[PDB]
């Protein structure tokens, strides 16, 4: 009584169909489930095959397909929105076995990666609202093709990159954040592999 | 609904501690999983009804008791650095074709000594008049840092009331020390909103972080203050 989901990571660009793969080994009739886990939370039901119509449909517009055949139950979504980046979990339950709870594969992390129609990288400088001194480095706008790297620097703090809604403006944008208690902003994303066309104020 | 608490939790090996888990649903079977990176969901223990509780995949070091419909309560015997985890507890109707509802799990760390916890400091940095005047936009940075366990919350609050908009929080703290056995750890956010609500005097921004830590009934001899669970803020005023 197991399933398996083969990959562990799955990235699908915002818009596009999306594919969570998922495999079971089970004695008798199997009873399949697949469950969405968003950051910090715990497991949410999607859908369940049971039995009758292979294609079935769940939560959020998601949906699988029973393949008996290729003794699969692949999970499916027309349109990926970038909140649907989550870790996503495949159960069974062998219908021989006795009502025993549910057995869960390891689970898929799949990532929306969002459209950036209107890049505009830039690196700006915010100052602490409590004193002078302090600061961070942020490096914003890029379009999701950059890739923010580590700092060499042991002393240098460097975030990887975030995606932020402005749902009242239909707006998006990524932001990586640096600062070091040594350091310039000019140089603070050097390391990385920025954009010829980062403004620099 | 399926409910857990405590959410988070920081032990000393060697102490014991109970989770408790209440649904209200007059689901028959509860049970108890364990969930490690790259080891998926690993079932403890379950229960088919009151009186009766069955051993699970790794029933080795816990303990459990059914004598209500309504509560599992899931007992640590002798807290050990291996039972550090997320437990989730999950409930359901008896029948296979029963889907199970989970609660929002417990974010659970052993430690050898408690004189590793400390909370964080936060610090909240203001939007730069480049972003505003090249965008039109602002975005307003926090950064909670020094803090272990990774037992933390970071929320953004605008004149009063919490908001999620325009708010994307890193993933994964970022350790100080990435050669230490117990680095403390850092974590940004960033709130971003119009050019001209920031510029707005009358709006008022703060950036809260709940960090899980020490209890009451928790000893503490050091001279520093005792890192007991608190909510650490910074705040800024919208600015001409």
């Known amino acids: 009584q197991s399933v398996a989901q083969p990959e562990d990571q799955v990235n699908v660009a915002e818009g596009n169909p999306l594919t969570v793969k998922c495999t079971y080994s089970?004695?008798?009739?199997?009873?399949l489930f697949w469950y969405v886990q968003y950051p910090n939370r715990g497991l949410q039901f999607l859908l369940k095959y049971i039995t009758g119509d292979n294609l079935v449909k769940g939560s959020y517009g998601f949906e699988a397909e029973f393949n008996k055949s290729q003794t699969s139950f692949h999970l499916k979504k027309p349109s990926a929105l970038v909140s649907d980046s989550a870790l996503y979990f495949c159960?069974?339950?062998?219908?021989?076995?006795?009502?025993?709870?549910?057995?869960f594969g390891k689970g898929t992390r799949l990532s929306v990666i969002a459209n950036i129609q209107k890049p505009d990288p830039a690196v700006y400088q915010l100052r602490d609202s409590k004193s002078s001194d302090k600061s961070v480095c942020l490096f914003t706008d890029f379009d999701s093709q950059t890739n923010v790297s580590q700092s060499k620097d042991s002393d240098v703090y460097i975030t990887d990159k975030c995606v932020l809604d402005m749902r009242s403006m239909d707006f998006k944008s990524n932001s990586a954040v640096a600062w070091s208690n040594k350091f310039a902003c000019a140089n603070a994303f050097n390391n990385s592999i920025i954009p010829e066309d980062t403004f620099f104020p | 609904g399926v409910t857990q608490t405590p959410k988070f939790q920081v032990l000393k090996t060697g102490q014991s501690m109970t989770l408790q888990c209440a649904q209200d649903?007059?689901?028959?079977?509860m049970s108890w999983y364990r969930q490690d990176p790259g080891m998926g969901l690993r079932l403890i223990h379950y229960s088919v009804g009151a009186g009766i509780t069955d051993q699970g995949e790794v029933p080795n070091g816990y303990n459990v008791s059914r004598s209500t419909t309504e509560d599992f309560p899931l007992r640590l015997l002798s807290a050990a650095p291996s039972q550090t985890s997320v437990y989730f507890c999950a409930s359901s109707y008896v029948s296979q074709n029963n889907e199970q509802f989970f609660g929002p799990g417990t974010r659970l760390t052993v430690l050898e000594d408690l004189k590793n916890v400390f909370p964080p400091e936060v610090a909240v940095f203001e939007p730069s008049e480049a972003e505003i005047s090249h965008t039109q936009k602002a975005t307003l940075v926090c950064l909670a840092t020094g803090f272990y366990p990774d037992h933390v919350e970071l929320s953004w609050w605008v004149n009063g009331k919490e908001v999620h908009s325009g708010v994307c929080t890193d993933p994964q703290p970022l350790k100080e020390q990435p050669a230490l056995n117990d680095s403390r750890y850092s974590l940004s956010s960033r709130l971003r909103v119009s050019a001209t609500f920031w510029q707005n005097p009358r709006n008022h921004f703060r950036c809260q972080v709940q960090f899980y830590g020490l209890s009451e009934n928790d000893e503490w001899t050091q001279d520093r203050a005792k890192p007991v669970t608190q909510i650490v803020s910074a705040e800024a005023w919208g600015r001409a």
């Open positions: 649903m007059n689901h028959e079977y």
């Open positions: 159960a069974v339950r062998d219908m021989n076995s006795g009502n025993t709870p549910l057995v």
């Open positions: 089970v004695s008798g009739n199997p009873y």
